[PDB]
């Protein structure tokens, strides 16, 4: 990463600094990494975080300089499509089934997050064009 | 028998 | 698959199916032959008669016993006896059923082998065995420790058996029998002026011996008593109707088992040979043989023989070592019954000499497998 | 191996015979970390493996052959969930129906379910007794071989109700109008009274095996029924071990001895008679025999037995009871005599009307005869006792057969019988702390009945594989014939036991000695207990069982002196008694040999027939309804023989699935854009990619077969792919929405 990237990333990091000490929480580290173009899993985030314990994950704060190696470590389409084709073969996906699997398997998200991202993409039958939704969410 | 007696 | 047992006496054949209560066929071991020219052409003559067939006609015939002293003789007649036994009287083919045969303890060794040779070669018997009579008397009596006095026609012998071991060195064979008692009864009856020369009246004398003879509890006083008073005299009706009368003689005949000297026999009597046979055993067992002491066979059947035995062997026993004499009333059949139960035992099924084994070993197989 | 945090395993525990654990670290080749789901963590040790648990979609399924891992814990769980929560009491284990009693009524038996089951295959419906019944009924309709149903277990389990409803099915589907069902159910109290007894572990145990044949005309209308009996435990009459009883009817007499109708029988209390007193346990608690006698009289009236016959029966039983008290004094080793004026003999001779002096003579001497002459010979006190007890057992066995002949008289009907369906009620396996010739016979009978069941299921699978064109060889025919050959055949235990009955002196010690000498080194299935020279062990289809020799030579022996029969035959005081003896070797034959032959007649009855099977199980001793104890239920499941049926199934191909449903369920794994254009060859390609070894799966015309556990492996790889894709989606959407929330922060 060059100086310009480090400056843009630090500025973004400081926007996430809610205490003024130049630091974010570990639980925000993943948010900053994804906002910066990475797509790590929560497991991957904890690994790059050093598998922190609950207490430091919830209250220990790290500055940009400590975050950066973690961003580096995280940094170092056809599968996404087949993954969606698992739940398909007319190119649609039920809204109920996607909601259930997103809220009950894997790294479970909230129902409100899923409703927010899914809002306006499903039709009256309850079908999602998943290729369009995928292109939309990858932009 | 065959000797000492008649049988 | 029931076996056969036929106890080959010297006087009777006893035979039946193994596991029956008592035998079906009992008939005298005689072959009869005619001794006269037949006049009536078309009589339907036939050359020879077996058992009750001969005995029913005996006045026309002469009768040979093919067995003397347990030794089979004139064996073509024996083969006729067996052929009649299986085919006519049992009505059952020998090739379907294994068969068990009985023998006196000590007798010429070849005789078993020839008997076996007949059984396999002539009759194609599936399997065969031979057993010592005084073993079977204990199977019959329900006893595992025993001394057995066994006497019929032909032979007498003692065998001690302790807990299913025989003690061979102690086995005494004594050659007195109902035959020699019969020949003596003839000779002595001549003393009262009756004569019996030939086989056809030998069986009358035998029938007298069976009904009238008895054994004195003490002989030597009663010999004088019957000469002193006639209440011991009794009378019997011959064939052809004339009555005869017999007195002291009727006890005097069976007394000769205890006084073999009268026949001119050198040996001890049955009581003293019984005692000597116990004496040859080791003293650890003599009390147990003294108590469990068993009579066997038809010659024992004379009334009072058991009390005479107990009295006289008491006189040789040391008075502490008490004794008992087991005379069951069946005992004329006991040697058969013990073979009937023996042949029914599962364990015995291993013991049969099979035709396949005889094919291997020849007539010598008997002594090798059997006792 | 495959063992991963996501999986579960069964740990043993003495109080729930298995417990479930979360596997907490992936195994690699000596200790495992196992969290537990009553809120505990443990570490568990692997010895020079715990049985893996089926995936949760499979468990609770209607047929245990669906289960990919087959285990005592898996089976027990699948039964427990269906009984305790779904309240379904019937299960299929193969062909076998397992049944578990509610200790309650249920709706299920209503007529509309009878109609519902009509017109369908046994696999097309959830299991219920009617689904067996109709598979028999339609086989009888379609094919000439008539049918049998077989029901097993402890007597408590509910074999009665399982027959009651099979009958109710047959009548209803036939559309027949009629007594016969009410008659059959009204017969049970006499068949219990004569044929059922208190055993150490059970208050009522059926000690004989009962066959009821339902017959039809050529339009399959029920025309009638008839009753047969087998395997009666004759030895129980004269002998019991501690705290047993003999047959209830004796105690029902003793509980009635004060009623004026029975005054002539001069009965005492149940401690007075040598047969009743010997058990040491007169009264069953909670069961009153005195009232039940009245129900037995009721059943007799409903089966038309005249009161004259009923009184005759009770007087003959009083006969046997008094007979058992007659006592013998020895005079010598080979002689005994009854004393003068002997009181129980005098009462017996009153009850039978027989001349006192003839019974007194014949009970103390035996006749021996030949076609030329006959002898009367004294006998030992031991033999006179054995003769008395044999006469008791022969009287009882003929009384039983005669009462059953009147039950048949009542049940028979004139119409010519086209065909019949036979419901067999029989005892299951038996095992106790002290176990005796009664158990040895029961367990031999169970060995043969289980061989027949093996024969049948092995046939039905070599049918099924030949429909699907699979080679014959793969099904391993398991074979318990070496154990039958050990028990039955000429060297075997029953034969040597009859053989020492006759051998001139014979004893429990010498018998054991002849056993050890013959078998002990020679045999796979025969073993000796270290401490004792008076016991033996059989490695037996359910279990090892120890049997103890001291009982057998007494129990084994029945021999009846013809003269005592030929005395009782003479009496005219009442006409039942000569009826009992209406039409030898049988008088010599030992109890074990009579049992062997009766079992042959039973097996030839069943082998002429096409069976269907039931198993009845008892969840608990206490009769707490809808409660189910793993400890008791496992013991029943072993005695029923479900567990070896399953161990035999696990050898084969337990799991069978259609190409269409396989394609449906694993469309997720199938790479649909790649997949080939037809179901059979594409799914063959897929499975060949997913599993290397064709030994592990077999291709039918319609169904794919797998060995045990591979369905679980498939379900795991399905879960892995599904969840890994799920994670990919989750993180992608999370990163999207967090970018949006950052954009809000920029706003
Ligand atoms: N009731 C009897 N009283 C006296 N002697 C008898 C009696 N019955 C048979 N005998 C004699 O027994 C002899 C036959 O004995 P037995 O034991 O049959 O010999 P085997 O068995 O060797 O043929 C014959 O001499 C016969 O006369
Ligand atoms: Mg003889």
The boundaries of the domain holding residue A13 are 2-77
Distance CA A52, CA A45 (A): 10
Q: Are 3 or more Cβ–Cβ pairs between C and D shorter than 8 Å?
A: yes
Judged by a CB distance cut-off of 8 A, whether residue B3 touches chain C is no
- Whether D176 is catalytic: no
CB contact under 8 A, B1 and C69: yes
CA angle in degrees (0–180, nearest 5) for D332-D337-D341? 150
Burial of D311 (0-12, 13-18, 19+ CB in 10 A): middle
Does residue D160 have an active-site annotation?
A: yes
Residues A33 and A9 in one domain: yes
Give the DSSP letter string of C117-141. Answer: HHHHHTT--SEEEEEEHHHHHHHHH
| A and C make contact (3+ CB pairs below 8 Å) | no
Q: Is D118 a catalytic residue?
A: no
A8 and A44 both lie in a single domain:
yes
Same domain, A93 and A72: no
Q: How far is the centre of ligand 2, averaged over its atoms, from the C-alpha of D148 (Å)?
A: 58
Does D154 show up as a binding residue in the annotation?
A: yes
Residue with tokens 């024996």: C78
Taking the centre of ligand 1 as the mean of its atom positions, its distance from the CA of residue C152, in whole angstroms, is 6
CATH number at C28-68: 2.30.36.70
Which residue in chain A has the smallest CA separation from D735? A34
Using CB atoms, list chains with 3+ pairs below 8 Å to chain C.
B, D
Q: Are residues A6 and A66 in the same domain?
A: yes
C301 lines ligand 1 (CB under 6 A): yes
Interchain contact C322–D (C-beta under 8 A): no
D153 is in an annotated binding site: yes
Strand C243-246 relative to strand D97-100: parallel, antiparallel, unpaired? unpaired
Last residue of a domain, one of A77, A96, A121: A77
- Residue at a domain's end among A77, A94, A118: A77
Tell me if C250 sits within 8 A of C214, measured CB to CB: yes
Q: Is the CB of C206 under 6 A from ligand 1?
A: yes
Fold: same for C1-27+69-134+334-367 and C135-181+271-333: yes
Query: Which of D718, D722, D717, D713 has the alpha carbon at shortest distance from D68?
Result: D713
Nearest to D46 by CA among D28, D73, D70: D28
Q: Of all atoms in ligand 1, which is nearest to the CA of residue C12?
A: 23
Residue D112: both structure tokens together: 């509309």
Rounded to whole angstroms, the Cα distance separating D90 from D98 reads 6
Contact assessment for residue D234 and residue D393, using Cβ atoms and an 8 Å cutoff? yes
Cβ A28 vs Cβ A64: under 8 Å: no
Mapped onto helix, strand or coil, the DSSP state of residue D193 is helix
**Residue-by-residue DSSP string for D544-575:** EEEEEGGGHHHHH-----HHHHHHHTT--S-S
Closest listed residue to residue D552, CA positions, set D602, D504, D604, D515: D515
Count of alpha carbons within 13 angstroms of residue D623, beta-carbon side: 6
Could you name the CATH architecture of D445-556?
Up-down Bundle (1.20)
For residue C204 and ligand 1, the question of a CB distance below 6 A is answered with no
Its CATH class, for the domain covering C1-27+69-134+334-367, is: alpha beta
Ligand 1 atom nearest to CA at C303: 3
Q: What's C135-181+271-333's CATH class? A: alpha beta
Is D454 in the active site? no
Asked whether residue A29 falls in the same domain as residue A8, the answer is: yes
Contact between D668 and A86 using a beta-carbon 8 Å cutoff: yes
Pocket mutation for ligand 1, best pick of C152, C203, C214, C256 (most atoms within 8 Å of C-beta): C152
Q: Is the CB of residue C70 below 6 angstroms from any atom belonging to ligand 1?
A: no
CB distance from D622 to chain A under 8 Å? no
Residue nearest to atom 22 of ligand 1 (CA): C9
Is D372 in contact with C26 (Cβ distance < 8 A)?
yes
Kind of pairing between the strands at D614-617 and D655-658: unpaired
Which stretches of D175-304 are DSSP H helices? 180-195, 248-254, 274-277, 289-302
Residue from C5, C26, C153, C295 to probe ligand 1 pocket by mutation (most atoms less than 8 Å from CB)? C153
- Pairwise CA distance, residues D422 & D415, whole Å: 18
Question: In the block, which residue shows the tokens 């083969």?
Answer: C79
Contacts 24+ apart (CB under 8 A), A1-8: A1/A68, A1/A71, A1/A72, A6/A64, A6/A68
Helix intervals (H) in D418-541: 437-467, 481-488, 493-502, 508-519
Q: And the tokens for A34?
A: 């994804």
Does the active-site annotation cover D235?
no
Using CA positions, which residue lies closest to atom 10 of ligand 1? C298
Alpha helices in D213-339, H assignment, sequence order: 248-254, 274-277, 289-302, 307-323
Contact C69 B2 (CB under 8 A): no
Q: Per the CB < 8 Å rule, is C71 touching B6? A: no
DSSP state string for D692-724: --GGGEEE-SSEEEE-TTHHHHHHHHHHHHHHH
Using the 8-state DSSP alphabet, how is residue D178 labeled?
-
Chain mean position to CA D647:
18
Residues A68 and A12 reside in one and the same domain: yes
Q: Which of B1, B5, B7 to mutate to test the interface with C (most CBs of C within 10 A)?
A: B7
Q: Which strands, in side-by-side order, build the sheet including C61-64?
A: C49-50, C31-34, C61-64
Residue A137 contacts D where some CB pair is shorter than 8 Å: yes
Distance CA C336, CA C4 (A): 11
Candidate list D206, D443, D454, D598, residue with the active-site label: D206
Contact with chain D for residue C142, Cβ under 8 A: yes
Strand partners, C16: C5
Measured from the Cα of C155, ligand 1's closest atom is 22
Kindly report the nearest CA distance between residue A125 and chain D, in angstroms.
22
Q: Which of residues 7-46 of C touch D (CB under 8 A)?
A: 19, 21-24, 26
Residues A121 and A71 in one domain: no
Query: Three-state SS for C72?
Result: strand
Q: Is D723 part of the contact surface with chain A (CB cutoff 8 Å)?
A: yes
> Which letter does DSSP use for residue D54 in this model?
P
Is the same domain home to A57 and A102?
no
Cα angle D551, D554, D557; round to 5: 135
Most ligand 1 atoms within 8 A of CB, residue of C299, C302, C304, C334 to mutate: C299
- C335 in reach of chain D (CB within 8 A): no
Query: Does C333 sit in the ligand 1 pocket, CB within 6 Å?
Result: no
Residues of D in contact with A105 (CB under 8 A): 722-723, 726
CB D683 within 8 A of CB D690: no
Examine the domain organization and report whether A54 and A99 are in the same domain: no
CB-ligand 1 contact for C273 (6 Å cutoff): no
CB A45 within 8 A of CB A33: yes
Q: What are the Cα distances from residue D459, in Å, to C206, D453, D648, D654?
A: 73, 10, 14, 16
* C70 alpha carbon, closest ligand: 1
Resolution in A: 3.6
CA distance C9 to chain D (A): 17
Sequence-separated contacts (24+) of D511-519 with Cβ below 8 Å: D511/D549, D511/D552, D511/D553, D512/D536, D512/D549, D514/C347, D515/D549, D518/D491, D519/D486, D519/D491, D519/D493
- Name the A residues in 10-29 with CB < 8 Å from any D CB: 12, 15-16
Residue found by looking up tokens 């003959």 in the block: D316
| Interface with chain D: mutation pick from C211, C340, C346, highest number of D CBs within 10 Å | C346
- Provide the number of CB pairs (under 8 Å) joining chain B to chain C: 11
What are the boundaries of each domain within chain C?
1-27+69-134+334-367, 28-68, 135-181+271-333, 182-270
Q: Which CATH superfamily is domain C182-270 in?
A: ATPase, substrate binding domain, subdomain 4 (3.90.640.10)
Atom of ligand 1 at shortest distance to CA of C153? 19
Smallest Cβ distance to D729: which of A30, A102, A113? Answer: A102
Q: Are strands D419-425 and D147-151 parallel, antiparallel or unpaired?
A: parallel
Q: What is the DSSP string of B1-7?
A: --SSS--
Chain D interface includes A119 (CB < 8 A): no
Hey, how many other C-beta atoms are within 10 angstroms of the C-beta on C251? 21
User: Pick from C138, C143, C346: which is nearest to D499 by CB?
Assistant: C346
The H or E element that residue D425 is part of is strand D419-425
User: Which burial class, exposed, middle or buried, applies to C217 when counting CB atoms under 10 A from its CB (0-12, 13-18, 19+)?
Assistant: middle
Nearest by Cα to D333 from C214, C52, C325, C87: C325
How far apart CA D638 and CA D72 sit, in angstroms, is 9
């Amino acid at each position: 990463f060059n100086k310009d990237q480090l400056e843009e990333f630090k500025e973004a990091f400081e926007l996430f600094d809610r205490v003024g000490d130049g630091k974010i929480l570990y639980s925000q580290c993943g948010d900053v990494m994804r906002a910066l173009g990475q797509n790590p899993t929560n497991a991957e985030v904890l690994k790059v975080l050093g598998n922190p314990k609950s207490d430091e994950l919830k209250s220990r704060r790290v500055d940009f300089e400590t975050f950066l190696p973690m961003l580096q470590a995280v940094a170092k389409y056809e599968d996404y499509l087949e993954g969606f084709r698992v739940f398909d073969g007319n190119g649609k996906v039920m809204g109920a089934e996607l909601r259930h699997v997103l809220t009950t398997l894997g790294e479970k998200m909230t129902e409100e997050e899923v409703e927010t991202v899914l809002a306006g993409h499903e039709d009256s039958n309850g079908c999602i064009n998943y290729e369009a939704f995928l292109k939309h969410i990858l932009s | 028998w065959x000797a000492x007696c008649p049988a | 698959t029931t076996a056969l047992v036929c106890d080959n006496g010297s006087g009777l054949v006893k035979a039946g199916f193994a596991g029956d209560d008592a035998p079906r066929a009992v008939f005298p071991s005689i072959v009869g032959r005619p001794r006269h020219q037949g006049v009536m052409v078309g009589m339907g003559q036939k050359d020879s008669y077996v058992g009750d067939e001969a005995q029913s006609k005996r006045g026309i015939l002469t009768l040979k016993y093919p067995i003397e002293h347990g030794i089979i003789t004139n064996w073509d007649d024996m083969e006729k006896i067996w052929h009649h036994t299986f085919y006519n009287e049992l009505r059952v083919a020998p090739e379907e059923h294994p068969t068990l045969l009985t023998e006196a303890p000590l007798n010429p060794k070849a005789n078993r082998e020839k008997m076996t040779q007949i059984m396999f070669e002539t009759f194609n018997v599936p399997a065969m065995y031979v057993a010592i009579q005084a073993v079977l008397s204990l199977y019959a009596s329900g006893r595992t420790t025993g001394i057995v006095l066994d006497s019929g026609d032909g032979v007498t012998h003692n065998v001690p058996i302790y807990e299913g071991y025989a003690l061979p060195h102690a086995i005494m064979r004594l050659d007195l029998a109902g035959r020699d008692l019969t020949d003596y009864l003839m000779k002595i009856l001549t003393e009262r002026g009756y004569s019996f020369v030939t086989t056809a009246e030998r069986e009358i004398v035998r029938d007298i011996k069976e009904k009238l003879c008895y054994v004195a509890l003490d002989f030597e006083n009663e010999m004088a008593t019957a000469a002193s008073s006639s209440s011991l005299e009794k009378s019997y009706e011959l064939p052809d109707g004339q009555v005869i009368t017999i007195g002291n003689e009727r006890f005097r005949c069976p007394e000769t088992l205890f006084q073999p000297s009268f026949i001119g026999m050198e040996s001890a009597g049955i009581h003293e040979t019984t005692y000597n046979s116990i004496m040859k055993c080791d003293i650890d067992i003599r009390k147990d043989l003294y108590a469990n002491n068993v009579m066997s066979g038809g010659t024992t059947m004379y009334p009072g023989i058991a009390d005479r035995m107990q009295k006289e062997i008491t006189a040789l026993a040391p008075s502490t070592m008490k004794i008992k004499i087991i005379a069951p009333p069946e005992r004329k059949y006991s040697v058969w019954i013990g073979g009937s139960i023996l042949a029914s035992l599962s364990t015995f099924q291993q013991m049969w000499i099979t035709k396949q084994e005889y094919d291997e070993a020849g007539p010598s197989i008997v002594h090798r497998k059997c006792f | 191996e495959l063992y991963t945090k996501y999986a579960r395993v069964w740990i043993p525990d003495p109080e729930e015979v298995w417990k479930s654990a979360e596997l907490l670290k992936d195994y690699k080749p000596k200790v495992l970390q196992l969290r537990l789901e009553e809120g505990k963590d443990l570490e568990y040790c692997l010895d020079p493996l715990p049985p893996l648990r089926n995936p949760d979609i499979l468990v609770g399924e209607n047929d245990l052959t669906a289960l990919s891992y087959l285990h005592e814990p898996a089976v027990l769980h699948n039964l427990k969930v269906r009984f305790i929560d779904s309240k379904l009491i019937y299960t299929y284990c193969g062909i076998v129906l397992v049944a578990i009693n509610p200790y309650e009524q249920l709706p299920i038996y209503g007529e509309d379910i009878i109609n519902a089951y009509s017109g369908q295959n046994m696999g097309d419906m959830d299991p219920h007794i009617f689904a067996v019944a109709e598979e028999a009924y339609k086989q009888m309709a379609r094919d000439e071989r008539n049918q049998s149903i077989i029901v097993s277990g402890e007597s408590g389990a509910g074999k009665t109700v399982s027959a009651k409803y099979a009958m109710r099915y047959f009548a209803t589907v036939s559309g027949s109008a009629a007594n016969v069902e009410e008659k059959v159910l009204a017969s049970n109290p006499i068949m219990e009274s004569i044929g059922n007894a208190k055993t150490t572990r059970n208050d009522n145990s059926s000690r004989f095996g009962k066959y009821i044949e339902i017959g039809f005309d050529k339009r399959y209308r029920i025309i009638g029924a008839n009753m047969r009996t087998y395997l009666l435990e004759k030895s129980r009459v004269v002998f019991q071990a501690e705290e047993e009883r003999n047959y209830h009817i004796f105690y029902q007499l003793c509980a009635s001895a004060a009623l004026p109708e029975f005054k002539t029988l001069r009965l005492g209390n149940a401690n007075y008679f040598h047969y009743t007193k010997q058990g040491g346990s007169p009264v069953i608690d909670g069961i009153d025999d005195a009232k039940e006698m009245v129900n037995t009289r009721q059943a007799c009236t409903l089966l038309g037995i005249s009161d004259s016959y009923q009184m005759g029966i009770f007087r003959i039983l009083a006969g046997i009871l008094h007979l058992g008290n007659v006592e013998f004094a020895s005079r010598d080793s080979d002689s005994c005599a009854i004393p003068p004026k002997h009181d129980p003999l005098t009462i017996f001779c009153d009850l039978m009307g027989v001349d006192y002096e003839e019974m007194a003579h014949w009970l103390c001497h035996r006749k021996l005869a030949t076609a030329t002459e006959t002898y009367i010979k004294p006998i030992s006190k031991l033999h006179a006792i054995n003769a008395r007890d044999a006469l008791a057992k022969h009287i009882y066995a003929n009384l039983f057969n005669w009462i059953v002949d009147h039950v048949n008289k009542a049940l028979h009907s004139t119409v010519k019988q086209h065909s019949f369906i036979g419901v067999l009620d029989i005892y299951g396996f038996e095992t106790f702390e002290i176990n005796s010739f009664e158990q040895f016979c029961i367990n031999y009978a169970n060995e043969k009945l289980q061989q027949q069941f093996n024969m049948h299921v092995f046939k039905l699978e070599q049918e099924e594989y030949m429909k699907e064109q699979i080679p014959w060889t793969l099904i391993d025919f398991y074979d318990n014939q070496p154990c039958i050959n050990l028990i039955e055949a000429k060297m075997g235990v029953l034969d040597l036991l009859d053989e020492e009955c006759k051998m001139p002196k014979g004893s429990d010690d010498t018998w054991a000695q002849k056993l050890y000498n013959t078998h002990l080194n020679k045999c796979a299935l025969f073993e000796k207990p270290r401490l004792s020279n008076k016991a033996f062990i059989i490695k037996h289809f359910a279990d090892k069982v120890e049997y103890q020799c001291e009982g057998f030579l007494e129990k084994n022996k029945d021999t009846v002196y013809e003269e005592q029969i030929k005395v009782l035959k003479s009496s005219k005081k009442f006409k039942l008694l000569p009826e009992l003896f209406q039409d030898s070797k049988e008088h010599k034959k030992t109890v074990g040999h009579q049992f062997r032959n009766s079992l042959h007649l039973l097996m030839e009855t069943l082998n002429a027939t096409t069976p269907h099977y039931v198993r009845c199980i008892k969840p608990n001793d206490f009769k707490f309804p809808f409660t189910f104890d793993e400890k008791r239920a496992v013991q029943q499941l072993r005695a029923c023989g479900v567990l070896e049926t399953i161990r035999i199934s696990a050898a084969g191909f337990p799991s069978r699935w259609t190409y269409q449903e396989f394609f449906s369920r694993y469309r997720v794994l199938m790479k649909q854009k790649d997949v080939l254009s037809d179901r059979k060859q594409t799914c063959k390609n897929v499975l060949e990619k997913l599993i290397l070894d064709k030994d592990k799966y077999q291709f039918g015309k319609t169904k794919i077969f797998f060995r045990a556990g591979q369905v679980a492996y498939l379900e795991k790889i399905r879960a892995d792919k599904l969840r890994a894709a799920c994670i990919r989606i989750q993180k992608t959407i999370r990163g999207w929405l967090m970018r949006k929330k950052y954009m809000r922060m920029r706003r």
